[PDB]
Amino acid sequence: HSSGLVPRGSHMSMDYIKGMTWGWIGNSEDWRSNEAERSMEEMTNLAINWTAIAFQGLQETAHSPDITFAEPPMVTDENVRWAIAKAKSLGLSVILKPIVNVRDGTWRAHINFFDKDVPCEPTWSQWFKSYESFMLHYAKLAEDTGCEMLCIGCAMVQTERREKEWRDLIQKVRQVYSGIITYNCDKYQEDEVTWWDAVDVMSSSGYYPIGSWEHHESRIKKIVESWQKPFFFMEAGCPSRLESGSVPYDWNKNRGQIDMDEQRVFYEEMFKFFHGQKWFYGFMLWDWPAKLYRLEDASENDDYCVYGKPAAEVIKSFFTSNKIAKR
Amino acid sequence: MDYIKGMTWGWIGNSEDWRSNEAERSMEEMTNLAINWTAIAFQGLQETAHSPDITFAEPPMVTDENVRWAIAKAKSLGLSVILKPIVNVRDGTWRAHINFFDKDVPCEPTWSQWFKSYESFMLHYAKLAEDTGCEMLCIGCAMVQTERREKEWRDLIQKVRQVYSGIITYNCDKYQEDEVTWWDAVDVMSSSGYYPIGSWEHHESRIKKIVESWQKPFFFMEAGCPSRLESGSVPYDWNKNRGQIDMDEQRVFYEEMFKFFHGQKWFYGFMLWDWPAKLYRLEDASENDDYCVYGKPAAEVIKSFFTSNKIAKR
Numbered sequence: 001h002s003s004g005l006v007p008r009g010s011h012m013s014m015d016y017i018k019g020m021t022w023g024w025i026g027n028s029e030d031w032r033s034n035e036a037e038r039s040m041e042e043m044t045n046l047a048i049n050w051t052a053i054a055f056q057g058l059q060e061t062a063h064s065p066d067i068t069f070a071e072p073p074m075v076t077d078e079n080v081r082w083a084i085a086k087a088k089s090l091g092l093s094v095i096l097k098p099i100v101n102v103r104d105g106t107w108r109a110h111i112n113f114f115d116k117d118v119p120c121e122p123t124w125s126q127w128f129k130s131y132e133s134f135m136l137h138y139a140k141l142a143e144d145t146g147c148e149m150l151c152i153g154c155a156m157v158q159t160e161r162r163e164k165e166w167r168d169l170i171q172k173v174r175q176v177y178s179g180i181i182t183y184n185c186d187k188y189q190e191d192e193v194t195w196w197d198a199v200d201v202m203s204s205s206g207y208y209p210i211g212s213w214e215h216h217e218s219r220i221k222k223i224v225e226s227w228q229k230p231f232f233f234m235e236a237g238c239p240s241r242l243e244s245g246s247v248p249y250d251w252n253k254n255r256g257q258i259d260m261d262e263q264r265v266f267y268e269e270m271f272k273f274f275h276g277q278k279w280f281y282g283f284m285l286w287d288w289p290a291k292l293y294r295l296e297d298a299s300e301n302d303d304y305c306v307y308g309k310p311a312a313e314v315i316k317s318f319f320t321s322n323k324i325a326k327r
Numbered sequence: 328m329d330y331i332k333g334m335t336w337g338w339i340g341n342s343e344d345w346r347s348n349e350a351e352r353s354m355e356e357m358t359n360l361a362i363n364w365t366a367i368a369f370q371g372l373q374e375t376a377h378s379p380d381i382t383f384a385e386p387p388m389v390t391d392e393n394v395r396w397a398i399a400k401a402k403s404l405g406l407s408v409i410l411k412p413i414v415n416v417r418d419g420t421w422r423a424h425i426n427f428f429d430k431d432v433p434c435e436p437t438w439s440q441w442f443k444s445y446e447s448f449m450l451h452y453a454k455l456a457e458d459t460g461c462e463m464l465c466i467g468c469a470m471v472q473t474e475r476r477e478k479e480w481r482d483l484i485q486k487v488r489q490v491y492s493g494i495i496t497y498n499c500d501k502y503q504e505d506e507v508t509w510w511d512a513v514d515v516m517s518s519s520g521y522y523p524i525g526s527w528e529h530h531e532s533r534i535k536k537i538v539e540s541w542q543k544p545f546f547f548m549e550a551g552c553p554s555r556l557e558s559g560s561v562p563y564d565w566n567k568n569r570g571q572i573d574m575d576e577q578r579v580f581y582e583e584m585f586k587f588f589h590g591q592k593w594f595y596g597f598m599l600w601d602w603p604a605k606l607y608r609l610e611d612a613s614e615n616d617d618y619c620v621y622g623k624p625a626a627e628v629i630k631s632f633f634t635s636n637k638i639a640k641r
């Protein structure tokens with residue numbers, strides 16, 4: 001498996017990702033609606049060639065070992081096979097992205113256990129066994145459906161120090177899934193994962209504020225060059241809200257306070273600094289819902305979604321531009 | 328260092344409870360355990376396990392006047408005092424999970440923010456400990472996921488030493504005696520002795536080796552067990568089998584703990600858990616499921632242990 005700028009041929013240079021995330025948060029009833037097919041078709045007008053099929057699994061608290069998946073209201077295996085096949089039927093390559101959320105609302109980056117096993121607390125080994133059942137379930141589904149890529153986790157910051165357990169999980173994933181593996185580290189954490197060598201492609205969440213993108217391009221370029229792996233953004237986006245570009249990751253910032261231009265300016269700056277560099281492999285944007293609002297409602301919508309908003313035209317002109325289209 | 332024969336008083340630290348007529352009577356009754364120490368214990372609060380701001384000395388938490396009262400009352404009863412300010416989390420998360428990213432990032436609160444807030448809380452009470460002549464200050468309790476922040480703990484302890492001239496301890500959690508790298512920075516090692524029935528001989532051997540490796544005094548800053556069905560298997564679990572009364576279970580826990588931990592010269596005794604500011608009636612004791620031993624057989628085990636000549640010689 002071990003490889004540098006190019007994943008070994010048996011797992012596929014690496015594609016340049018022109019992507020949009022579809023289906024979050026992963027609600028069976030939404031994915032089985034008529035609306036879901038129309039949503040995914042409309043998403044193709046972004047001139048994407050990839051989609052990340054994203055959906056939640058659940059644990060009760062940040063310190064509980066048991067992860068539930070594929071039970072109401074979460075997506076069924078049939079819902080997931082449908083989304084993958086529909087995406088492929090539209091000419092998209094697929095990243096399967098199972099994401100653990102915490103029922104009590106805690107940000108998943110805080111999921112954590114004591115360093116030292118004690119008789120009175122759940123252990124890292126218990127949580128990793130549950131997380132392995134979750135991720136291997138979907139790794140097997142990714143193999144059966146021919147997903148080009150699997151993302152084995154997303155911003156699991158307080159688990160990343162568990163290097164032996166992550167490398168053990170990745171070895172188990174390799175036994176059931178033959179495609180490309182990535183892990184999506186959180187914003188600002190590109191240099192903090194000690195096991196990047198164990199995946200094929202490095203990726204992070206590009207929620208960097210307006211005015212910071214030139215700085216982050218220099219920072220990330222040096223990290224990627226130190227690892228000699230391909231790198232892309234597994235998430236990047238910004239809500240269409242007042243001052244959201246200062247905190248593009250904060251999905252609770254200024255709800256209902258619409259600013260289309262703020263989202264537009266975020267995208268223009270991100271693409272100004274991250275474009276066609278040979279070490280960079282593009283963008284999986286965030287995000288596009290299974291049930292898409294009416295075009296007539298777009299100018300009053302405060303979501304990350306770009307549908308009907310000026311940012312969609314920045315994305316389309318970037319993805320159809322010769323410099324990007326040739327990558 | 329004294330041999331501690333102690334009971335914790337006042338938890339969770341509710342101003343209304345501490346100002347009740349009942350509080351004085353509760354503390355007087357506690358002296359019948361033949362204790363010579365009490366830990367005056369009370370909460371501060373932060374919203375979540377990952378929020379940096381600690382609130383204290385605001386309703387419903389104890390006023391500074393309430394804390395001066397409890398310290399002076401205890402001393403008026405001939406007791407030495409450990410002051411024990413404890414941070415809790417409003418959302419109910421066990422404080423051992425309080426934690427921040429190792430690496431400062433612009434999008435999250437930082438260790439330095441939380442430690443500044445924790446410093447404000449602990450230095451407030453260190454100054455009150457000094458002003459009131461508390462013999463000892465406990466600078467934290469089972470803060471497991473902070474203990475790796477060694478520089479910040481040592482920095483806090485330096486600030487506490489500038490304002491408080493008494494004995495400092497830190498109370499590590501059950502099973503964590505060998506896991507604190509900065510024991511040297513406090514005067515006395517302490518832990519939470521919530522070891523299950525059948526395990527005390529094992530833990531005496533484990534802890535003896537840890538304490539002799541450090542060459543510092545050690546005692547249990549907490550130890551106890553609810554009077555509940557099968558509580559002795561998980562003495563620390565305050566939610567285990569609520570309302571399912573078993574006096575003998577609590578009694579057996581105490582007899583075993585004292586069988587194995589007694590007069591060893593490396594060992595400096597027990598701060599037991601715990602005794603409320605508002606004490607239940609004696610006639611309600613046989614239906615009470617709390618850690619409190621008042622009116623229960625375990626109280627007689629404690630009294631006979633604390634008044635025994637081998638423990639009286641220490």
Ligand SMILES: OC[C@H]1O[C@@H](O[C@H]2[C@H](O)[C@H](O)[C@H](O[C@H]3[C@H](O)[C@H](O)[C@@H](O)O[C@@H]3CO)O[C@@H]2CO)[C@@H](O)[C@@H](O)[C@@H]1O
Nearest residue numbers: 024025099101154155205235248249250251286287304
């Ligand atoms: O879909 C309804 C569901 O929304 C829940 O909040 C979500 C937000 O709406 C965003 O979709 C948010 O996106 C973040 C993801 O968690 C990414 O993995 C992360 O890296 O950044 C993006 C952008 O902020 O996700 C949350 C869920 O995690 C929530 O409000 C829920 O109650 C509601 O039903």
Ligand SMILES: OC[C@H]1O[C@@H](O[C@H]2[C@H](O)[C@H](O)[C@H](O[C@H]3[C@H](O)[C@H](O)[C@@H](O)O[C@@H]3CO)O[C@@H]2CO)[C@@H](O)[C@@H](O)[C@@H]1O
Nearest residue numbers: 338339413415468469519549562563564565600601618
């Ligand atoms: O006093 C009412 C208050 O109780 C809260 O629960 C407490 C329990 O009743 C116990 O007193 C428990 O004691 C633990 C302490 O946290 C020690 O520091 C720890 O080391 O172990 C002991 C023994 O288990 O403390 C909790 C509070 O932390 C809670 O139910 C609250 O809602 C209620 O108002």
